[PDB]
Amino acid sequence: MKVAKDLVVSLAYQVRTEDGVLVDESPVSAPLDYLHGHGSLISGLETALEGHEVGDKFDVAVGANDAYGQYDENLVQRVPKDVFMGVDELQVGMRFLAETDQGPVPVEITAVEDDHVVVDGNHMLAGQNLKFNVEVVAIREATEEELAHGHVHGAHDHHHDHDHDGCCGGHGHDHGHEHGGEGCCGGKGNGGCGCH
C-alpha cells in the first residue's frame, strides 16, 4: 500500500532552515500521527509523502513553494519591453500595473534580463524554502468521524480545540512601569556620600 489522502500516518520529521535554525523536529520514539493530505502538516509535505513506504525515511523540500512562505508564482511575470517602452520612464524597480485574466495585478521590475525583463513584488516574506526529513511509520484510513473532524482514533478524546482566551503573546501595549526593581536608593546627593 502507499500513503495517500484519508489515511492516518505517524511520520516523524526534522525541519531546519538554511539559516541553520530548527523550527520543529519529531523524534522516532514519538511520531506525529495525522490524516495524510488533510490533517495538519503543510500540504506540500503530505502530497510529497504519497507513494513512499511504511518505515522508510525520505527528505522533501517544502516551504515557500507550499508551506510557510507560499511564494505567489501568480505575481511573477517576465516580459520584454516590446509590450511597453513609453510609460514616461522605463527603469528596473519602477512599479507597473499588469491586468492579467485574474484581474488587475500590480508588478514592479526588479532586474531586466536578456530576452525579456523581470517583474515581481517582494519575496522578503516569501521564497522561504525549508528542508526537512520525513519518515512514515504507519498508514491506515480513518472512519467517517475520523475524517470528519480530521482526527484518528480520538475525535472527542482529542484535547480542547481553540477554546481558551485572554492570552496575548505579543507586546507594545504598556512598557516601563517602575524603571526596574524597587525604587532603589539613588536619587541625588553629590558632594561626597562616601566615594572612590
Swiss-Prot record:
Pfam families the record matches? FKBP_C
The residues listed in the UniProt record as binding Ni(2+), with positions renumbered to this chain, are: 167-168, 184-185, 193, 195
List GO terms (cellular component aspect): cytosol
The EC code for this enzyme is 5.2.1.8
Q: Which UniProt keywords apply?
A: Chaperone, Cobalt, Copper, Cytoplasm, Isomerase, Metal-binding, Nickel, Rotamase, Zinc
Q: Which reaction does it catalyse?
A: [protein]-peptidylproline (omega=180) = [protein]-peptidylproline (omega=0)
Concerning InterPro entries, the annotation shows: PPIase_dom_sf, PPIase_FKBP_dom, SlpA/SlyD-like_ins_sf
Primary localisation category: cytoplasm
Q: Where is this region: PPIase second part?
A: 129-151
Which top EC class applies here?
isomerase
Relay the domain remarks: The N-terminal region consists of two globular folded domains that contain prolyl isomerase and chaperone activities.
Family per record: Belongs to the FKBP-type PPIase family.
Name used for this protein in its record: FKBP-type peptidyl-prolyl cis-trans isomerase SlyD
Task: Write down the species.
Answer: Escherichia coli (strain K12)
The taxonomy runs:
Bacteria, Pseudomonadati, Pseudomonadota, Gammaproteobacteria, Enterobacterales
